[PDB]
Write a protein that binds this ligand. Structure first.
Ligand SMILES: CCNc1c(N)n(Cc2ccccc2)c(=O)[nH]c1=O
Ligand SMILES: CCNc1c(N)n(Cc2ccccc2)c(=O)[nH]c1=O
Ligand SMILES: CCNc1c(N)n(Cc2ccccc2)c(=O)[nH]c1=O
Ligand SMILES: CCNc1c(N)n(Cc2ccccc2)c(=O)[nH]c1=O
Ligand SMILES: [Cl-]
Ligand SMILES: [Cl-]
Ligand SMILES: [Cl-]
Ligand SMILES: [Cl-]
Lengths: 299, 293, 299, 293
């Protein structure tokens, strides 16, 4: 039948099971509900989507922990967002987010973020706003790491054009890992639907990204060394991520990934709404921070 | 007589929100294990195997999920709820039937202890069949705690809960040993000016009869609580620095049960199987074949 | 007499005494020779000047420690720089750098950096290159901090124009501290010469900066929250600075403030020279890093 | 008999360059004090007051500048040089005349110890008038150290220096107590395959005569060395976490001398005056008026 034709990019946060890998620390709750310093891990990637201008977001978690994500985040209305929830019964891979979120996505552009990925740096807002406005094809970010063999790895020719993607290569072609933030057009769900599980039994995001690469529709932007991309893969790196955020925040007196703040700066909530969000947290440093935001100009 | 143990793992209010909005503090990790493994380990090192875990209505089921009935670790665990955070002394009313006619010990669910001959420092408090024993520890900010005053001869003469003008820098730690008198003392407590049933009031009751032993926990011991986001990060880094230097874990309950002969080599072997692919299971398997002094 | 008229901006690092403040840790050596993680503190501000394109640099230290700075840094030729040395017998204030360095500066533009100031962030190269190219007036950077009362503080009108500078105000007009990096034109030495000591007995850089402000020649650029400006004011912040750098470097496998690297990327030294600098450090991670730089493209 | 002490604070080569290019590692800070305060404090806690400090030619004058003749702290300090890093056992040749006919103890200038009843753990090694005493400690990477093998009954039967295939995870720490035999044993040592005079060879010489006491330093003690940039940062954070929690310092030599009665309240008062405006002087002044148990 006939369709008609007349900002809308939707977001997805994958906040499912980290299996048994960080057990026993994660036996009683999801990794993405563990705090990084002063706030739940999931505030960080949520803030990343918000900085990209995305207000309609699906959170994918396990059946066991969806209610706790719901208690924490609600339907998003407090922060000028709309948050929806979906469950992932079995951790069958990151590309399953698109099958799980098919109805949520509809006919729109989308972005996927890993619920345990934290980014920090300058003009991040601008770096994200950019990729979001590129409507067709896919956009990813490559970042120089010490251990590229743990990641999807991008190979570049001498001109600096991406020419290949390999998932966890034993002999990486570069030290450039693909980060856990992905922007996609309307082709992604069909590409995902045609994926066959890898030898590990999982539906691989690198296969989605390779599909765009083969079509000549993959933009790979370098996220330079002056950005911090932390993930919380080990107990040791989770501790480092906490110390990192604590050092920045205690130095600056400004928070990284405060959603109330980001919504306020985006004009998604007003001063009066922000004041209401501060009232219940007024006795701790978090509510006090929100209060101070109403009476200060921050450039 | 036998001594039963109680871990109070109740609500920290809104103090660490939003980090703790979703889940209680004592279910969160300190480095590589849930915070509550640490006080549980403290009780186990005092030789206590019958333990009641008290937490909020919402999270008691989740402590139950995490720890089970304890039989996998040669423990006997029971659970109870504290409907509202109305004071630490409520532990003895909530746990009155659990305690029965036995000796007891209470540990706070967010207290972490590290040091040498702990097994021995606890055993000597555990051995007193009469009176109460507590530990005093020199801190920078005594006003946050129950504060003990000593006379010139080193005798404890007063306790004040969160004084505006502390008499010393010696705070009472969150580990308490009691005789058969504590339930009856807790039953006669009146709420304090802050609307709480105070553990310090209990301790003062023993002090007034000359039945409070106040042992000094020396500077060569580490007492950490997880009261702020900053100190929480400090506790994790501390445990990480010790464990990665030594190749030995602090407060691994499976290891402690095994060393106490509460489980045998074959039970530990079974416990190691689920986490065989990660560091924790690998650690437990290694405990089967290594002599550690 | 008649003068004639036909990149040349010179740099100065103040690396003098921190008094007794960090004693006893600084009894046996200068604070600016203490390592921050894996390299001496002074590598960081030196790298900052290098990133600004400055190759001619004066290091001001105490008589006691100048030889150790000389042993460490030499005359700069190894790194495509020229380094000169001057002593500050008594810690009489930061603005004394211009009287001490008067002959070094000559008729040129200049930049002053504090030897204990560390900066990290994206397009820092570009942010510095910018200020260096502004030839007339002065350029400074303002950064939101938790404790502005410890610093020179800048006040802005509602339009965002700087209107006042106050040195360590008990009641700061904003949370914007002036950072320890300063770019000056040819007027600075005369302004410094006319300074009278403050009540603390010191020649204040904020008085120099106010002089430019009163003339309408002070540019104050915001260094945003996605940049890290760390100083090493306390034992606690020195520890945090070390952990910060260690987390970035171990994540990325790239160093912050490696002068050999920066000189190589600036074309001030070639591959063969870099190879020679790596030979003596070949057994440790530092020399190994320098070696890897010859065989890798880093964007 | 009296026991003299030696701190070996010599060169770490190019291993931590460029951090240590300008100055030796043991002059750098661990948190708030120079690294060498920590082993000095260890000797002082073992009751040792006559101490020889051995370092590189370049930096001995700077240890002399930092520490003086020790009389301000009720110590008797002397200095000597190790012209080249030719093995720890060189300490006893360099210090032969210093030692004379007395008992001795050697500590490495970059070893940091923390734990309870250290004063007591050292005093019991200090009391042996015959033989040698060392401490073994469970580590993750024993191949970096002198490694001790035990039989089934817990007896030390072998030592290997940096084995490719360690017999256990028990490393010998950098603190050694010796009787009058050590100089003569060191004098007969031959350089090892690595061109070093080995402390492990000295220790094996005592072991062969059944005169090596190998005490276990338990897991409740922290032994830190500052061998890598990473571990250096871990040592500082560890000391910071303890000191800021307790309001008490680890390895403050002025305090240790005062508690040992080597200086009096009036001497400490004078020592506090120079740094009165910072935390360290404020700490020392506070020690005059506070009972710390
Ligand atoms: C640099 C870290 N990112 C970040 C930024 N940039 N901002 C400023 C900002 C948010 C949204 C719209 C305009 C400005 C925050 O408030 N919180 C943040 O966490
Ligand atoms: C280092 C803190 N304490 C501790 C000790 N001491 N032990 C040894 C031990 C446990 C039970 C019976 C005998 C010996 C552990 O296994 N785990 C520990 O956490
Ligand atoms: C982001 C931290 N700054 C930094 C940067 N940007 N670079 C890249 C660079 C240096 C000079 C010219 C072009 C590129 C380093 O090599 N070391 C650094 O420390
Ligand atoms: C915590 C490590 N040990 C330590 C101890 N034990 N003491 C107490 C003490 C010193 C000398 C004689 C009697 C008592 C310190 O003053 N500083 C210390 O660093
Ligand atoms: Cl920014
Ligand atoms: Cl002690
Ligand atoms: Cl960058
Ligand atoms: Cl122990």
């Amino acid at each position: 039948h006939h369709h008609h034709h007349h900002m809308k990019r939707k977001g997805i946060i994958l906040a499912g099971g980290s299996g048994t890998r960080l057990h026993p620390a994660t036996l009683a709750i999801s990794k993405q509900l563990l705090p990084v310093y002063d706030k739940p891990m999931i505030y960080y990637p949520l803030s990343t989507l918000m900085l990209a201008g995305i207000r309609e977001i699906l959170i994918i978690s396990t059946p066991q922990d969806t209610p706790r994500f719901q208690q924490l985040l609600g339907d998003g209305s407090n922060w000028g967002l709309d948050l929806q929830y979906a469950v992932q019964p079995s951790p069958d891979g990151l590309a399953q987010a698109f099958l799980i979120g098919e109805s949520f996505i509809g006919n729109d552009l989308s972005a996927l973020v890993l619920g345990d990925n934290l980014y920090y740096g300058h003009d991040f807002h601008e770096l994200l706003g950019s990729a979001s406005q590129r409507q067709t094809g896919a956009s990813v970010f490559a970042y120089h790491v010490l251990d590229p063999e743990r990641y999807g790895v991008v190979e570049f020719d001498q001109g600096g054009k991406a020419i290949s993607l390999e998932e966890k290569p034993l002999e990486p072609k570069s030290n450039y890992a693909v980060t856990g933030l992905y922007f996609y057009d309307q082709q992604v769900v069909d590409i995902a639907r045609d994926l066959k599980p890898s030898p590990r039994g999982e539906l691989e995001i690198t296969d989605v990204n390779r599909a765009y690469l083969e079509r000549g529709q993959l933009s790979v932007e370098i996220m330079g060394r002056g950005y911090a991309w932390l993930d919380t893969g080990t107990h040791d790196s989770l501790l480092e991520a906490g110390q990192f955020i604590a050092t920045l925040e205690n130095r600056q007196g400004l928070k990284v990934a405060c959603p109330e703040e980001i919504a306020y700066r985006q004009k998604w909530i007003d001063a009066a709404q922000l004041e209401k969000l501060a009232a219940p947290l007024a006795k701790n440093g978090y509510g006090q921070y929100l209060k101070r935001l109403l009476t200060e100009t921050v450039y």
